[PDB]
Amino acid sequence: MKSRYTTEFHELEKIGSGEFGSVFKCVKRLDGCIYAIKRSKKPSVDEQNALREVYAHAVLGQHSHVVRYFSAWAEDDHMLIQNEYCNGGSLADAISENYRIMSYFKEAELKDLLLQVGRGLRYIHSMSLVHMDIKPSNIFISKVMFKIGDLGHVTRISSPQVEEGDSRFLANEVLQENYTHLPKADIFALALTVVCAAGAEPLPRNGDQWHEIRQGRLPRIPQVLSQEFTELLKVMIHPDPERRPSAMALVKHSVL
Ligand SMILES: O=C(O)CCn1c2ccc(O)cc2c2c3c(c(-c4ccccc4)cc21)C(=O)NC3=O
Numbered sequence: 518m519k520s521r522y523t524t525e526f527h528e529l530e531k532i533g534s535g536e537f538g539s540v541f542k543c544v545k546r547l548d549g550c551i552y553a554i555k556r557s558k559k560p561s562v563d564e565q566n567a568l569r570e571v572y573a574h575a576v577l578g579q580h581s582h583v584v585r586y587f588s589a590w591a592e593d594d595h596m597l598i599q600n601e602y603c604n605g606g607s608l609a610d611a612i613s614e615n616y617r618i619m620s621y622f623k624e625a626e627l628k629d630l631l632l633q634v635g636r637g638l639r640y641i642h643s644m645s646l647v648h649m650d651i652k653p654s655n656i657f658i659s660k661v662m663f664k665i666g667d668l669g670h671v672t673r674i675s676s677p678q679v680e681e682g683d684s685r686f687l688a689n690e691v692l693q694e695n696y697t698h699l700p701k702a703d704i705f706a707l708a709l710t711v712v713c714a715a716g717a718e719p720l721p722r723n724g725d726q727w728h729e730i731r732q733g734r735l736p737r738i739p740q741v742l743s744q745e746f747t748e749l750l751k752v753m754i755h756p757d758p759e760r761r762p763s764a765m766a767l768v769k770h771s772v773l
Pocket residue numbers: 532533534540553554555584598600601602603604605606607654655657666667668
């Protein structure tokens with residue numbers, strides 16, 4: 518062996534685990550910097566999916582609100598991607614700590630989260646790409662800076678086949694195999710991500726609560742928000758994708 522991975526990096530800790538691969542905090546020996554490196558089993562259609570993640574990274578390396586890519590390589594029976602390390606952890610971890618402490622993101626902080634990820638979405642979408650798995654565990658924290666990561670579901674905007682993202686954040690039209698307005702699926706997921714940050718109960722994976730949200734009804738939020746902000750969230754989850762704002766329209770919105 519003596520892996521590129523082994524030879525170029527000192528592995529500090531495991532930071533993430535999944536159905537296909539783990540993420541490690543590593544120090545690159547030569548440059549002294551810390552990176553996040555995902556190491557997954559080399560896969561085929563599964564390989565086409567794994568490569569799209571690499572291709573998406575290699576074109577989305579220039580935005581402040583998208584995790585930067587450095588390198589990808591294959592060795593042994595594993596594929597590796599070396600990304601920017603965000604030292605603030607995931608949004609999902611911040612939200613889970615807030616949950617236990619009963620102190621959530623305040624309206625000002627929710628607006629900042631919405632605007633920052635909204636700018637990341639505007640960049641991705643400007644590249645004729647959609648993310649398709651926006652949720653708190655795929656937003657990373659680094660002024661706080663929020664950065665979209667996990668490009669495992671990224672596809673071109675006019676794709677006729679799509680890999681469906683997390684059920685809790687999934688827009689109905691996507692579940693229905695209607696891919697005419699893919700960018701608005703990202704918008705819908707961003708609104709529910711902001712709801713979670715606002716202190717909501719864990720979102721439903723299926724059943725009747727799941728359908729009511731998809732009717733355009735915001736889950737309960739345990740804090741008072743301006744009507745104008747609540748109304749922006751509600752329109753981002755409109756059952757008609759064309760009524761949801763585009764990312765460009767979101768980032769220029771008077772509420773933000
Ligand atoms: O398990 C999770 O949801 C997060 C794992 N994870 C963490 C945990 C704590 C951190 O401080 C950063 C990260 C982290 C990072 C990334 C990932 C990641 C997700 C998908 C593919 C490749 C890396 C997971 C990733 C990344 O690209 N930059 C990152 O900083």
